[PDB]
């Protein structure tokens, strides 16, 4: 059970930090409101660690209706599929570390891969519609696997047992303006259990 903590995923902002029954910030208000308007329940955001399936993820499974929720098991659509102006954090291309928090279900021992996709370079973020696969690159920009549970087998993937985190280092493609990263944490074939996390990032406008 997990989600991306850094950079903060939709589940980190709206889930780990802000809860709809007692928010301390306005940043998730639209996501919370639009989900209630669509018949979603406030209590669903308490399952921010549970965007889950039991299969090989987007490298294999091409037919999902939804991106961030991946037509998963806890709810479909997920809270995280809701069209909204989601909270966005400033981000840079090149070598970046992504931090999965797996504290609520620290399945280190049969972790197999961490996969990351980004929106196409010409993507135009639309807060009124759901993400579609046409918004995303066909292939992942970062796909790091280990012999299951053996983190010494990939120098890009680190287990932090003290924080119950997995740290993955990725080469983030050059981007400008507002983008989305779609990420997966997959366990091996014993379960094929896989967790999904979207990150809203703003690359700004900078060129040498
Ligand atoms: Cu943490
Ligand atoms: Cu779990
Ligand atoms: Na490693």
Numbering used by the authors: 1 to 78, 79E, 80 to 152, 153C, 154 to 208
Publication text:
When used as part of enzyme cocktails, LPMOs significantly boost the activity of classical glycoside hydrolases, thereby offering great potential for the sustainable breakdown of recalcitrant biomass within a commercial setting. Through mass spectrometry and HPLC analysis of released products, we show that this enzyme has mixed C1–C4 oxidising activity on cellulose and boosts the breakdown of this recalcitrant polysaccharide by glycoside hydrolases.
To gain further insights into the molecular basis for the biochemical properties of TtAA10A, and to probe this, potentially unusual, dual Cu structure, we determined the crystal structure for the recombinantly expressed protein to 1.4 Å resolution. A single copper ion was modelled at this position coordinated in a typical T-shaped geometry by the amino terminus and side chain of His 1 and the side chain imidazole of His 107. In the axial positions around the active site copper ion, TtAA10A has Phe 195 and Gly 105. Our structure reveals the position of the second copper-binding site that was observed in the EPR spectra.
